[PDB]
């Protein structure tokens, strides 16, 4: 039929892939980026989506929307919505039981269902694919967390349809990640698979069973408020403390200063997966004072040591709920950029008494990769 795509509609970042001729291409956006922030901004003149939206967040915090996935398919009264709302700069209001985000856009008050905000993100992902393919894109598989209920899946599906997509199927993220690695193609006895998914804002452990190639979710665990961004935070605080010791100044109430430091820390954290030190080079960070410094891998691990180690606790709980020893796991699959952290891999490999991890697919892209594989199956192109 048409060309069908796989879309990871992520809490922090979204990613789109296409399976063409026995090969997945993860598609770079117009800025060369293979992932796109799940951000939508509203200004005096325009509606911004992705990188453009995330780049003006410090300047426009009340009209720049993110974490829409934390709201999707939920009711305003839901306690989860009530805690989370306390940590966003934009407004969330009640429209007859259902949460809406309220913003100012071109001088008028406007509100949006979370599915409408995620539809804007999905629109961007579709455009991304169409720019690469040079063809109209309609058919898609969109992924969701394994714990999403009927209402959250429907709303996700509805976000796709508002975007003009035909959602072939909603499938689970950890199932998508297993598909990416072709685990459902390893013919033999039933396989027990653990997915260790440490993203930007969420941490998910899932245990799946694959019998004759069919997936069942045995267990889910994790922490909906632990992600790569928590590690970034600790580096930010570390560097704010260091600037204060050095310059006897506190940069904390300058939003742009803290934003620019945070972006540098995000970059440094990635660098630390590959190198044993990272440099921070910020021109005129605060009151005209430059900030050139660095951090070692060791210092980064020390700052985060409790957070890293504690990831093993939901691993133990998922195993318990699935009724399995750790030795019963046949495949371990890494998803999320933070699973590139050597200390995390080491922690998890040691926990599984030396077992090798599925880590060769970019963990930022593994969800979209699997979703693309599955898109191709469903449309008859694989
Ligand atoms: Mg994810």
Element (H, E) at 7: strand 5-9
Residue numbering of the annotated binding site for ADP: 12-13, 200, 266, 269, 273, 337
95 catalytic, yes or no?
Answer: no
- Could you tell me if 7 and 32 lie in one domain? yes
Residues 6+ apart with CB under 8 A from 150: none
Pairing between β-strand 40-42 and β-strand 47-49 as defined by DSSP bridges: antiparallel
Annotate 149-174 with b (16+ C-beta within 10 A) or e (fewer): eeebbebbbbbbebbebebbebbbbb
Of these residues, 54, 67, 69, 115, which one is catalytic? 69
- Could you tell me if 239 and 207 lie in one domain? no
CATH number at residue 370: 3.30.420.40
- Could you tell me if 52 and 127 lie in one domain? yes
Please, are residues 228 and 269 in contact by the beta-carbon 8 Å criterion?
yes
Of these residues, 8, 204, 229, 232, which one is catalytic? 8
- Could you tell me if 131 and 144 lie in one domain? yes
- Could you tell me if 70 and 106 lie in one domain? yes
- Could you tell me if 194 and 306 lie in one domain? no
User: Which phi and psi (to 5°) does residue 102 adopt?
Assistant: -105, 135
The CA 108 to ligand 1 mean position distance, Å, reads: 34
Give the number of other Cβ atoms within 10 Å of residue 124's Cβ: 25
- Could you tell me if 235 and 252 lie in one domain? yes
Of the candidates 251, 280, 310, which is a domain's last residue? 310
Query: In terms of residue numbers, what domain contains 2?
Result: 1-65+121-185+359-382
The CA 247 to ligand 1 mean position distance, Å, reads: 39
Separation between Cα atoms, residue 131 and residue 35, nearest integer Å: 15
Separation between Cα atoms, residue 362 and residue 26, nearest integer Å: 10
- Could you tell me if 58 and 130 lie in one domain? yes
197 catalytic, yes or no?
Answer: yes
Residue numbering of the annotated binding site: 10-13, 69, 200-202, 266-273, 337-340
Of these residues, 67, 84, 115, 173, which one is catalytic? 173
Alpha-carbon distance values, 62 to 98, 120, 174, 261 (Å): 20, 18, 33, 20
The CA 109 to ligand 1 mean position distance, Å, reads: 32
Give the number of other Cβ atoms within 10 Å of residue 107's Cβ: 7
Separation between Cα atoms, residue 44 and residue 46, nearest integer Å: 6
CATH number at residue 71: 3.30.30.30
The CA 184 to ligand 1 mean position distance, Å, reads: 20
What does the DSSP assignment read for 280-336? Answer: EEEEEEETTEEEEEEEEHHHHHHHHHHHHHHTHHHHHHHHHHHT--GGG--EEEEES
- Give the technique used to solve this structure: X-ray
- Could you tell me if 168 and 264 lie in one domain? no
255 catalytic, yes or no?
Answer: no
The CA 232 to ligand 1 mean position distance, Å, reads: 17
Residue numbering of the annotated binding site for ATP: 10-13, 69, 200-202, 266-273, 337-340
The CA 244 to ligand 1 mean position distance, Å, reads: 35
CATH number at residue 258: 3.90.640.10
C-alpha dihedral sign at 257, 231, 203, 122: positive
Residues 6+ apart with CB under 8 A from 25: 17, 18, 132
- Could you tell me if 46 and 134 lie in one domain? yes
Count how many domains the chain has.
4
Please, are residues 335 and 143 in contact by the beta-carbon 8 Å criterion?
no
Token pair 């979370």: residue: 114
What does the DSSP assignment read for 123-186? Answer: HHHHHHHHHHHSS---EEEEEE-TT--HHHHHHHHHHHHHTT-EEEEEEEHHHHHHHHTTGGG-
- Could you tell me if 330 and 366 lie in one domain? no
User: Which phi and psi (to 5°) does residue 86 adopt?
Assistant: -65, -15
69 catalytic, yes or no?
Answer: yes
- Could you tell me if 290 and 368 lie in one domain? no
Pairing between β-strand 5-9 and β-strand 139-144 as defined by DSSP bridges: parallel
Structure tokens at 1: 């039929």
The CA 210 to ligand 1 mean position distance, Å, reads: 21
């Amino acid at each position: 039929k048409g060309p069908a795509v796989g879309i990871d509609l992520g809490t922090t970042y979204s990613c789109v892939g296409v399976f063409q001729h026995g090969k997945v291409e993860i598609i770079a956006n117009d800025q060369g980026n293979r992932t796109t922030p799940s951000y939508v901004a509203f200004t005096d003149t325009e509606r911004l989506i992705g990188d453009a939206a995330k780049n003006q967040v410090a300047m426009n915090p009340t009209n720049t929307v993110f974490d829409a996935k934390r709201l999707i398919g939920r009711r305003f009264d839901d306690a989860v919505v009530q805690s989370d709302m306390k940590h966003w700069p934009f407004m969330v209001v009640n429209d007859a039981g259902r949460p809406k985000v309220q913003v100012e856009y071109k001088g008028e008050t406007k509100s949006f269902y979370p599915e409408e905000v995620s539809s804007m993100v999905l629109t961007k992902m579709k455009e991304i694919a169409e720019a690469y393919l040079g063809k109209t894109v309609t058919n898609a598989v969109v992924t969701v967390p394994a714990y999403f209920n009927d209402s959250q899946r429907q709303a996700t599906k509805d976000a796709g349809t508002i975007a003009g997509l035909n959602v072939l199927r909603i499938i689970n993220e950890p199932t998508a990640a297993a598909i990416a690695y072709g685990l459902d193609k390893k013919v033999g006895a039933e396989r027990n698979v653990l997915i260790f998914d440490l993203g930007g804002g969420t941490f998910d452990v899932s245990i799946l069973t694959i019998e004759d190639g069919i997936f069942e979710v045995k267990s889910t665990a994790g922490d909906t408020h632990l992600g790569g961004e928590d590690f970034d935070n600790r580096m930010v605080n570390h560097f704010i403390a260091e600037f204060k010791r050095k310059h006897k100044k506190d940069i904390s109430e300058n939003k742009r200063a803290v934003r620019r430091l945070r972006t540098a820390c995000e970059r440094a954290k990635r660098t630390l997966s590959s190198s044993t030190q990272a440099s921070i080079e910020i021109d005129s960070l605060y009151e005209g004072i430059d900030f050139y410094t660095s951090i070692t891998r060791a210092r980064f691990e020390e700052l985060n040591a409790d957070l890293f180690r504690g990831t093993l606790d939901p691993v133990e709980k998922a195993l318990r709920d699935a009724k399995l020893d750790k030795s019963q796991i046949h495949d371990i699959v890494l998803v999320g950029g933070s699973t590139r952290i050597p200390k995390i891999q080491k922690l998890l490999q040691d926990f599984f008494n030396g077992k090798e991890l599925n880590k060769s697919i970019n963990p930022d892209e593994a969800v979209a990769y699997g979703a693309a594989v599955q898109a191709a199956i469903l449309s008859g192109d694989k």
